[PDB]
Amino acid sequence: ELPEDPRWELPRDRLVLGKPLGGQVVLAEAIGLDKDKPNRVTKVAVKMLKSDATEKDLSDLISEMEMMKMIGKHKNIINLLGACTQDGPLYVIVEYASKGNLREYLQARRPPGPEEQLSSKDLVSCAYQVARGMEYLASKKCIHRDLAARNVLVTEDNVMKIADFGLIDYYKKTTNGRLPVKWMAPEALFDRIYTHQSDVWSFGVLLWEIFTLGGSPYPGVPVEELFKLLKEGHRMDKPSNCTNELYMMMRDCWHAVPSQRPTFKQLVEDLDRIVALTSNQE
Numbered sequence: 001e002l003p004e005d006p007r008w009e010l011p012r013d014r015l016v017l018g019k020p021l022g023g024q025v026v027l028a029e030a031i032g033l034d035k036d037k038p039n040r041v042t043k044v045a046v047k048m049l050k051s052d053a054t055e056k057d058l059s060d061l062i063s064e065m066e067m068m069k070m071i072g073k074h075k076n077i078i079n080l081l082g083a084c085t086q087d088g089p090l091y092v093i094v095e096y097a098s099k100g101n102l103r104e105y106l107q108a109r110r111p112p113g114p115e116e117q118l119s120s121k122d123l124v125s126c127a128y129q130v131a132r133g134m135e136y137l138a139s140k141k142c143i144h145r146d147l148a149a150r151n152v153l154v155t156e157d158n159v160m161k162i163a164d165f166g167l168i169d170y171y172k173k174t175t176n177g178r179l180p181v182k183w184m185a186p187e188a189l190f191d192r193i194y195t196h197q198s199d200v201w202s203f204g205v206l207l208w209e210i211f212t213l214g215g216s217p218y219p220g221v222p223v224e225e226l227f228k229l230l231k232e233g234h235r236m237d238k239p240s241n242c243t244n245e246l247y248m249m250m251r252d253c254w255h256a257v258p259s260q261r262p263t264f265k266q267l268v269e270d271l272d273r274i275v276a277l278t279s280n281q282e
């Protein structure tokens with residue numbers, strides 16, 4: 001009993017559902033996703049209601065879909081492709097990223113104790129692509145609030161895509177057993193203040209994740225000890241196989257004063273320059 005938006009509506013019979021990927025997300029094939037391409041099958045990700053889903057859950061899912069419509073398309077975000085709103089449960093159809101989240105992608109490509117190995121240029125490129133996605137989201141007045149390698153997805157073509165931009169208990173942990181408070185700006189953590197500046201702080205932690213090839217920030221540090229580290233002005237160590245220039249970029253993202261952090265616009269220009277100058281030879 002949902003209103004149709006014909007621009008975005010895909011007939012239910014065009015969506016071949018497949019195995020679970022993670023609400024609730026399944027892999028699917030869409031036939032004729034594109035009006036000018038009715039015989040093309042596209043691998044997509046379909047977000048839907050779980051079996052014991054509340055009225056708020058359906059309200060959250062609709063809100064994420066409507067937010068994605070307003071933000072519009074960018075290469076370095078997970079883009080809305082369609083929806084099934086008529087004659088069944090709500091399906092929100094988004095881009096599929098076959099190579100998983102950036103933490104998984106990096107860990108799988110660590111040098112031996114893997115199939116593929118990343119160059120220094122490839123790591124800086126990852127950072128540039130996330131910065132570009134975030135600059136686009138910022139330009140649309142979207143504050144992420146949980147920017148982390150876990151919320152960046154990687155496509156078959158190694159494109160970085162920001163996820164969960166459309167959507168706390170400080171002690172709740174991720175699937176992977178990590179504490180999301182470890183990505184949060186002090187003003188977000190202590191004062192509940194979330195800005196593009198607090199997302200730049202999170203981007204600092206994400207740069208550290210990239211240069212540690214999916215390293216875990218503050219391993220073994222519980223929430224109460226993290227709070228004390230932040231109050232003391234502690235900053236994470238420079239990763240090995242990270243230039244002084246990229247470490248100083250991380251430190252600048254971690255400025256105690258939100259106004260003094262670089263913007264995503266600044267980070268994109270600086271990372272553009274650094275990519276050009278960074279070796280792909282190791």
Ligand SMILES: O=C(Nc1n[nH]c2cc(-c3ccc(O)cc3)ccc12)c1ccccc1
Binds near residue numbers: 064
């Ligand atoms: O999740 C995967 N792929 C995904 N491709 N696109 C996605 C989009 C989402 C998604 C979309 C909207 C949301 O609100 C939250 C998550 C989740 C997973 C994916 C994946 C998992 C394991 C191995 C390989 C791929």
